[PDB]
Structure 1
Amino acid sequence: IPCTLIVVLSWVSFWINKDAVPARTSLGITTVLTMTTLSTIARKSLPKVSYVTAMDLFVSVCFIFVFSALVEYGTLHYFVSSQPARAAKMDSYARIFFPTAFCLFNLVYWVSYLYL
């Protein structure tokens, strides 16, 4: 629940206008820090097994999603100064591409790990 809500919270940066640079930047990086703090407790319960389980896989995918959101905003802000009409579609693409990707991952994950 907390990792999923952290990812859907990091998605909030997309709807914010591109001119609020400190707002979106601090949002992304603070959700990154939150994702790390959550990633700790997932593995705190288990021994030092040298393979990828399902919960550390889930939390790693969530962290990757947050990281990718922040890097997406970074590249968007970089393209703002170079090509504005090009950057105008990146936000509208991300708004649909990030939630659908996370839902597809959730589906395949919760289906593959329960058919076993």
Structure 2
Amino acid sequence: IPCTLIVVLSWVSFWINKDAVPARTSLGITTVLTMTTLSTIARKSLPKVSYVTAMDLFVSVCFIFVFSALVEYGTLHYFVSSQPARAAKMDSYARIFFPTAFCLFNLVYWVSYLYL
């Protein structure tokens, strides 16, 4: 529940205007902070096994997703100066690309790990 909440939280940065640079950077980096804090707390439960479980895989995919949102905004801010025609429809693409990719990830993960 908290990791999916943090991912949906990182999603909300797309609805902010692309001109308010401190706003979107602060949202993204604060989200990486909370995801980092949340990662270590969950991992303590089980021992220091060297293989991946279905729970550190989950938090790893969530951390890369938050990271992906932040670096995507980075490329957006880099590209708004070079060509606005490509950076105009980036947020409209992200608003539909991130939730669908996450729901498909959730679908494949939960089906593949509840079939076993």
TM-score norm. by structure 1 comes to: 0.98
Q: CA deviation at 1:105?
A: 0.4
Q: CA deviation at 1:3?
A: 0.5
Q: Which runs of 4+ in 1 moved over 4 A?
A: none
Q: CA deviation at 1:33?
A: 0.5
Q: CA deviation at 1:86?
A: 1.1
Q: Which residue of structure 2 aligns with residue 9 of structure 1?
A: 9
Point out where structure 2 has 5 or more consecutive residues left out of the alignment.
none
Q: CA deviation at 1:16?
A: 0.7
Instruction: For residue 17 of structure 1, give the secondary structure of its aligned residue in structure 2.
Output: coil
Q: CA deviation at 1:42?
A: 1.6
Give deviations 1:7-46, integer Å, cap 9, x for gaps.
Answer: 0010011011101100000000000010001101121011
Instruction: For residue 68 of structure 1, give the secondary structure of its aligned residue in structure 2.
Output: helix
TM-score norm. by structure 2 comes to: 0.98
Point out where structure 1 has 5 or more consecutive residues left out of the alignment.
none
Percent identity between the two aligned chains: 100
Alpha-carbon distance between aligned partners in 1 of 2:86 and 2:28, rounded to the nearest angstrom: 22
Instruction: For residue 54 of structure 1, give the secondary structure of its aligned residue in structure 2.
Output: coil
Q: Which residue of structure 1 aligns with residue 21 of structure 2?
A: 21
Count of aligned pairs: 116
Which stretch shifts more, 19-28 or 40-49? Answer: 40-49
